[PDB]
């Protein structure tokens, strides 16, 4: 009984994909250095 808006749940979702995309680069760097 929390009234979570369907619409704003969209934004709640959307960031995650960007963040994951970043996570990819983070992992690559952490495993293989700057270059």
């Amino acid at each position: 009984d929390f009234s979570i808006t369907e619409v704003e749940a969209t934004q709640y979702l959307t960031l995650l994909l960007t963040v994951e995309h970043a996570y990819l680069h983070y992992y690559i760097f952490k495993n293989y250095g700057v270059f």
Binding site: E8, Q11, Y12, L15, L16, V19, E20, Y23, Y26
Partner: protein, 58 residues
Amino acid sequence: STLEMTQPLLEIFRNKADTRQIAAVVFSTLAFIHNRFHPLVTNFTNKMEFVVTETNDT
């Protein structure tokens, strides 16, 4: 749900008056993704002082 959620997420991010919550949200999301990808992971917690970017030139 454990978070000081501050539900109006967009306007919270739109506040600018504080950055602690922004940074904590970022970090926590990072941890979330990491623990997704692997079941048993963590990051050193002491401090990671971070940045806010203000303009296209930056």
